[PDB]
């Protein structure tokens, strides 16, 4: 049906594709450049302890602040933390701007993400019989019931898979499932042993040629064993348990079915539900059938949170089940987003800041900027003459790190369209002239928009 593309796979490169980890010794000391990082040895070592905090299940509701100017690698450090944890531990990134939902109060939006950052791992065994129905045969009973004339003591079903077939002897009550489900010979079904009922996947595509037209799609014969008994490990967040309880999905009545045909509007999940969910979760943890695996809620531009968000986070972080929260901020001393009379450092209320482990991120030396240019070039696949490297690094000292990382691809285009397989000073000197930085542009504004005028900028 679909025409599979045989062409080679490759990965897009984004602003942080070069970062692969925190780059630490087994002693936890930062290597001066490793895993894509250059410098920030203090902040990487601190994040390494935070990583070991998260992997140790004693933590609940601790707070971290990544504090430092724009460009200083706070986003890179958060992503590196996430990569050090890996996919088995939740990392839930948001900005403060995402909390201003129109659809529920923002303390609900934040508590959703707070519970998204908390994972639950449940182990259960799946136990089914599974195949194409090869036969159905009633076993007439030894002692029939009077007045009925028919009495069946067993129904026998043949199931085949790709890997075998079995004669299956079933309690005759399965007649109810077969008759409702309209199971026929050549249909693919499974029998689940916790009910003894059956469900029909479809007709086996071995029968796809029975007619010139039949109104169903066929399905392949199951490629497993005819009997499955498997442990299954389910990734669950506690937010999944919130929604699954607060809006049940499978309801067969008109109001349920009309509900599932209309937009699944968020609702202000009660603390009573969440607190009972916690109690049943803690029960199953004590049974040992589930693991709690708290992860990371990361809030970037946390200075976009307002004082109502921060005061709720006080209560939230005090929960006995809670992720770690990592905050990033760049806002100096600034007015609290929802308390116009109050200024504080980082734009974080002094009440709340006292809870956080602050990690400072510092600027970069000229030689670190150069090393970052080397790492970024080989990641985007660009290759530079050393004089192009030094010119890119020089703009990085004079203007900004980000601006210079953004010159690499434009200059690579200009090089290849000039027939050069590597970029040189002539291309950098050309990329930097097509693509201005904010300062040179602001100078054009300041010179041209000194007044109103037919060709003036507008203000």
């Amino acid at each position: 049906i679909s025409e599979v593309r045989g062409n080679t796979r490759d990965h897009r490169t984004a602003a942080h594709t070069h970062i692969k980890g925190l780059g630490l010794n087994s002693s936890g000391i930062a290597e001066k450049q490793a895993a894509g990082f250059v410098g920030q040895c203090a902040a990487r070592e601190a994040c390494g302890v935070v990583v070991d905090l998260i992997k140790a299940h004693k933590m609940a509701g601790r707070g971290v602040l990544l504090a430092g100017g724009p460009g200083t690698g706070k986003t890179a450090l958060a992503l590196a933390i996430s990569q050090e944890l890996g996919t088995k531990i939740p990392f839930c990134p948001i900005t403060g701007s995402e909390i201003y939902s129109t659809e529920v109060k923002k303390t609900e939006v934040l508590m959703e993400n707070f519970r998204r950052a908390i994972g639950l791992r449940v182990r259960e065994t799946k136990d089914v019989y599974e195949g194409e129905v090869t036969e159905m045969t009633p076993e007439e009973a030894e002692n029939p019931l009077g007045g009925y004339g028919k009495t069946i003591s067993t129904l026998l079903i043949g199931l085949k898979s790709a890997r075998g077939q079995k004669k299956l002897r079933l309690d005759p009550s399965i007649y109810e499932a077969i008759q409702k489900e309209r199971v026929q010979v050549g249909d693919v079904i499974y029998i689940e042993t916790n009910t003894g009922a059956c469900k029909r996947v479809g007709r086996s595509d071995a029968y796809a040629t029975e007619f010139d037209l039949e109104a169903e799609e066929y399905v392949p014969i199951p490629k497993g064993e005819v009997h499955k008994k498997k442990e299954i490990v389910q990734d669950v967040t506690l937010h999944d348990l919130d929604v699954a309880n607060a809006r049940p999905q499978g309801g067969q009545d008109i109001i349920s079915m009309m509900g599932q045909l209309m937009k699944p509007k968020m609702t202000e999940i009660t603390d009573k539900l969440r607190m009972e969910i916690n109690k049943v979760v803690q029960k199953y943890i004590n049974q040992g059938v589930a693991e709690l695996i708290p992860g990371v809620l990361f809030i970037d531009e946390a200075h976009m949170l307002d004082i109502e968000c921060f005061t709720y986070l006080n209560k939230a972080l005090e929960s006995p089940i809670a992720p770690i929260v990592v905050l990033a901020s760049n806002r100096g001393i600034a007015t609290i987003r929802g308390a116009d009379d109050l200024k504080a450092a980082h734009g974080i209320p002094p009440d709340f800041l006292q809870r956080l482990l602050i990690i400072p991120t510092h600027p970069y030396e000229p030689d670190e900027i150069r090393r970052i240019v080397r790492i970024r070039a080989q990641t985007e696949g660009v290759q530079l003459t050393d004089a192009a490297v030094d010119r890119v690094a020089e703009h990085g000292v004079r203007i900004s790190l980000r601006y210079c990382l953004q010159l690499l691809a434009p200059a690579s285009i200009l090089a290849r369209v000039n027939g050069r397989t590597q970029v040189d000073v002539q291309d950098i000197a050309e990329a930097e002239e097509l693509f201005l930085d904010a300062r040179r542009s602001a100078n054009i504004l300041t010179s041209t928009g000194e007044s109103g005028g037919l060709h003036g900028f507008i203000s």
């Binding site: 299940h57 004693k58 724009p70 309690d171 972080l317 900027i369 004079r398």
Partner: protein, 441 residues
Amino acid sequence: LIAAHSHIRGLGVDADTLEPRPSSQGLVGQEKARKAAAVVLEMIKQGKIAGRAVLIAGPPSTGKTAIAMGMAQSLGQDVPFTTLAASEIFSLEMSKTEALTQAFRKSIGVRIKEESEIMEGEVVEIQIDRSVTGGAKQGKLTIKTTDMEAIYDMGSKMIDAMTKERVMAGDIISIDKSSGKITKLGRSYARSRDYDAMGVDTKFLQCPEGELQKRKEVVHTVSLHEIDVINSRTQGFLALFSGDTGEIRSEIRDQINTKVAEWKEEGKAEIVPGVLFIDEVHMLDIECFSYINRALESDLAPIVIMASNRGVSRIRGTDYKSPHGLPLDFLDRVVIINTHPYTPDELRQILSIRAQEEEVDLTPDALALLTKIGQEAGLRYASNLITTSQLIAAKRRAKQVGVEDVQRSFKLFYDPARSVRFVQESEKRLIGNDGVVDFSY
């Protein structure tokens, strides 16, 4: 997990004299405030008096939440203790007034008793009849003790339960006849061999003895809010949990207040009034305070406890300041508890409890240094360094947290005051309140 207050296991007072011990049940110091909270705790337990607003006041830290969490532990599970952050009240689904009304009514329990009746026996036989193409179902259960056999007719709802439970002969089952729920307790027969897919060979049990029927007195506690939600509706009682409930009309509450009183006179219910704890109460608006002040005056009002960090501070939603940031005609109705910042030996004792709760073996000099840090960086920061130094010690395989680990932790992680200096030392490179910044070296 271990949380911020997980070591708090009570208020730490002599139940006879209400004298605070200098350290017990995880609380330390605050003796005047702990005695005051113990008098409040006693008049909570006595139930006699309604609508007392008690404000716990103090600087940040100094245990105001810890005291309120100590109170909650000392009440136990039975008395309602509704924690509310004042920022929860600004719903989009309901007004602040309605959100406060629900928070009050969540804090009054109705403790309702019923005589359930239960069956427990071996299933000897099951018969089920089913209408082809659905609709009606019929059946009979034959169920046994060592001492009885009887045949019970079954309806559709019970047959749905029987088939969902996959009840079979030789199962030991119990049936709560009042709710209709079934539980399989085990089996007396072996699991058969004639059929496949029968599932789990559940626990063996001897047959139940005695009569099949037994009466069972059971007691359930429900809030006035939970009675509100199901009586404002025909359908959709999941709004108890999803929070879909709108602004419930006052006619419904006026009726419920009347009927719950009558249920008390009938002896059907006990009213168990509990606590609403409004943390960060300074975050409410003037409109909220001018609701609480008269909501308190009702016979079904809970006892309302509050905490505030604020000094003489602006009231939200108005142009002017007041003590605690709370209106004066509100504070008129409040008796205020003041908490006081800890001494170094109080800091040392708290940090020892935090260390023991986290199971961290501090060396004595590390506890001394953490105390010195506690005096100057703060109790929360000095607490954060305990779990951090434990991890650093584990990197070097140290069997105890040494001074080197606390110094290493102090180096890696800044306290608030040091971070404020770091901000002031980098005002050029951080984003200012003017939005200006310099990105260059």
